[PDB]
Design an enzyme around this catalytic site. Sequence first.
Site, PDB file in Angstrom:
ATOM      1  N   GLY A 288       2.969   5.885  10.385  1.00 32.51           N
ATOM      2  CA  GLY A 288       4.384   5.814  10.118  1.00 32.51           C
ATOM      3  C   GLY A 288       4.978   4.407  10.462  1.00 32.51           C
ATOM      4  O   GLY A 288       5.945   4.260  10.203  1.00 32.51           O
TER       5      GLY A 288
ATOM      6  N   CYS B 156       3.391   1.563   9.583  1.00 28.64           N
ATOM      7  CA  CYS B 156       3.369   0.120   8.662  1.00 28.64           C
ATOM      8  C   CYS B 156       4.831  -0.373   8.380  1.00 28.64           C
ATOM      9  O   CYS B 156       5.707   0.489   8.117  1.00 28.64           O
ATOM     10  CB  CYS B 156       2.492   0.579   7.652  1.00 28.64           C
ATOM     11  SG  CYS B 156       0.850   1.563   8.092  1.00 28.64           S
TER      12      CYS B 156
ATOM     13  N   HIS C  87       0.865  -1.134  -0.083  1.00 28.08           N
ATOM     14  CA  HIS C  87      -0.024   0.057   0.024  1.00 28.08           C
ATOM     15  C   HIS C  87       0.899   1.241   0.140  1.00 28.08           C
ATOM     16  O   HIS C  87       0.252   2.385  -0.272  1.00 28.08           O
ATOM     17  CB  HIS C  87      -1.169  -0.007   0.871  1.00 28.08           C
ATOM     18  CG  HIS C  87      -0.622   0.051   2.329  1.00 28.08           C
ATOM     19  ND1 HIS C  87      -0.036   0.962   2.921  1.00 28.08           N
ATOM     20  CD2 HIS C  87      -0.842  -0.706   3.548  1.00 28.08           C
ATOM     21  CE1 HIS C  87       0.314   1.081   4.133  1.00 28.08           C
ATOM     22  NE2 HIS C  87      -0.304   0.002   4.636  1.00 28.08           N
TER      23      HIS C  87
HETATM   24  N1  LIG Z   1      -4.438   1.597   0.958  1.00 22.28           N
HETATM   25  C1  LIG Z   1      -4.400   1.343   2.291  1.00 22.28           C
HETATM   26  S1  LIG Z   1      -5.303   0.319   2.882  1.00 22.28           S
HETATM   27  C2  LIG Z   1      -3.413   2.201   3.341  1.00 22.28           C
HETATM   28  C3  LIG Z   1      -2.518   3.090   2.857  1.00 22.28           C
HETATM   29  C4  LIG Z   1      -1.693   3.960   3.875  1.00 22.28           C
HETATM   30  C5  LIG Z   1      -1.881   3.635   5.334  1.00 22.28           C
HETATM   31  C6  LIG Z   1      -2.885   2.362   5.467  1.00 22.28           C
HETATM   32  C7  LIG Z   1      -3.550   2.081   4.701  1.00 22.28           C
HETATM   33  O1  LIG Z   1      -2.696   2.517   7.011  1.00 22.28           O
HETATM   34  C8  LIG Z   1      -1.936   3.463   7.293  1.00 22.28           C
HETATM   35  O2  LIG Z   1      -1.426   4.055   6.455  1.00 22.28           O
END
Ligand SMILES: NC(=S)c1ccc2c(c1)OCO2
EC number: 3.4.19.12
Lengths: 304, 300
Positions: free
Chosen positions: B143, B145, B41
């Site tokens: 931040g 992830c 993502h």
């Molecule tokens: N497109 C998604 S599911 C996503 C994108 C960024 C994110 C996130 C989820 O959780 C915090 O940062």
Amino acid sequence: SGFRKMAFPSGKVEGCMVQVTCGTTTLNGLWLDDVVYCPRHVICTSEDMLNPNYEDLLIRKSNHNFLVQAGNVQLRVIGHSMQNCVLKLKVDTANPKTPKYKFVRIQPGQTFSVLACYNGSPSGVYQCAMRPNFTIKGSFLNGSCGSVGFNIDYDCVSFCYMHHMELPTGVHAGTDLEGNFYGPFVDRQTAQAAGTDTTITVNVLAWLYAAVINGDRWFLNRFTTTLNDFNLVAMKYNYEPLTQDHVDILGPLSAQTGIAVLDMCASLKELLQNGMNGRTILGSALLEDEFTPFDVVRQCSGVT
Amino acid sequence: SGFRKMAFPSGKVEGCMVQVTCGTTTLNGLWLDDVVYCPRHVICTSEDMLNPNYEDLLIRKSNHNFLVQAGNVQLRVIGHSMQNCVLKLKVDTANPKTPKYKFVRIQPGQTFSVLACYNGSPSGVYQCAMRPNFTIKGSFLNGSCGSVGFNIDYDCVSFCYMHHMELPTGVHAGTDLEGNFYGPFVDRQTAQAAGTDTTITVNVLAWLYAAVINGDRWFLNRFTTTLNDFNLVAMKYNYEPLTQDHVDILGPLSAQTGIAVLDMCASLKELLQNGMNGRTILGSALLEDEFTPFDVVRQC
Ligand SMILES: NC(=S)c1ccc2c(c1)OCO2
Ligand SMILES: [Cl-]
Ligand code: NA
């Protein structure tokens, strides 16, 4: 979001842990620059431990009496001295993994990370508070002596604790890295007990803020109070006196939540009378007192 | 003695954490050999949050669109592929701190250490369990992830979790290092919700065995129970069913303490009925379900 008891990352300390052996006793040492630090009780037989004369037992020892192992590699001990209750073994090699470090003595109520070690091998890491009665509630088995406690500020390890002994109630006692005990304890096999402990008031308040910030708000109320009225409740419930300095350190959290300290004391006051009878705040049925204000802000801001 | 939520020493994982940037999005990656693993993502923009077509977004990326940083050093990306929900960035350098490692998928009830990280810099370490509803109760801010979950058994690092998102109830969802989600969750911001969570019974029993090892006996009773009557009672408190597998797994702790598994089940049935009446177990006023039978023996 979420709120967990969190240790500092232990890698800068893992790089410093060694095995130290003197006769039949193996325990852990801390290898920084060209010195290995370990409890002086390493020199003692079981008989010595009853009434040790460390002055006498140490002049009797020589460098070759101490085996130091960093992984599979023997370190050569080129000198030995004692500072208070810590043994300093000078070795022929500076630890090339020595981090930026200080030795610091912590205050009761402050937290630190313990790297629990066996035979010079890091086993686990967890957070402790230095209790008001100068014990810690750790998890330590035979072989854990010389395990250290520390904080990390940017890239600087502050070493604050070295593990020495278990007390009859199952709580733990140790020294700073200059070999001064926390608490009225001695490094001998004699009758010793922890003082009646007390609850760290400012940390409980910190944790109630952590709870509010995570959407736990049920315990709150419209009221407020005085240091003087609260402290009379605190002393009744074996809580530490709350001071103006404590109210001031919680400043950021009073700000972030809109709930003043004497506001939360009122909440805390109400909680002491009644009991939360199996009811829960941040997944606890107890009033948790091992998170500092800094722990709550640091965790709820993501400092690295 | 004593009993604590204890994390694995994090050093071996610390030496693997880097910063990945794509667009205006920065998160953590895991640098093993010449591969950086991160949540796919990272390639999503503002519009690509609800219904991203990852195959279409990734085909439009060149290696140079991905800024990988290990401390000060920029690592140069020379290749990219996707595996399930994980992005794999091939880089020009193998990580010299790569430990002995493996990728393992855990089952509900299993515990692991999380190294929470921001901008490729580790922040702290704590123990989690995979909940029965395939979430974890962590501590994760924006931040975080690409932060990972791991075990270390006899010098080998077993990666079991990579952090992808926070669900509306404030619990956390992620994948194995093969990029398969735990539970029914997807890497889309479409409304998703975890199943009702339940208590990990086999772990609560392991923890009562820890308490007895550490010298607590107050909660024991003269009763026993059939396995079936235990489950009919325990499910009324949203406890997971206890299986014969669970009974077998507790055999060693049963032998060490001399308290049969179904006798300990009768104590748990009573604690659910009575609560603790102002007492604690291993410094808790709750029944703790994030220690496995293996964690109890490791620590005791
Ligand atoms: N497109 C998604 S599911 C996503 C994108 C960024 C994110 C996130 C989820 O959780 C915090 O940062
Ligand atoms: Cl598993
Ligand atoms: Na109030």
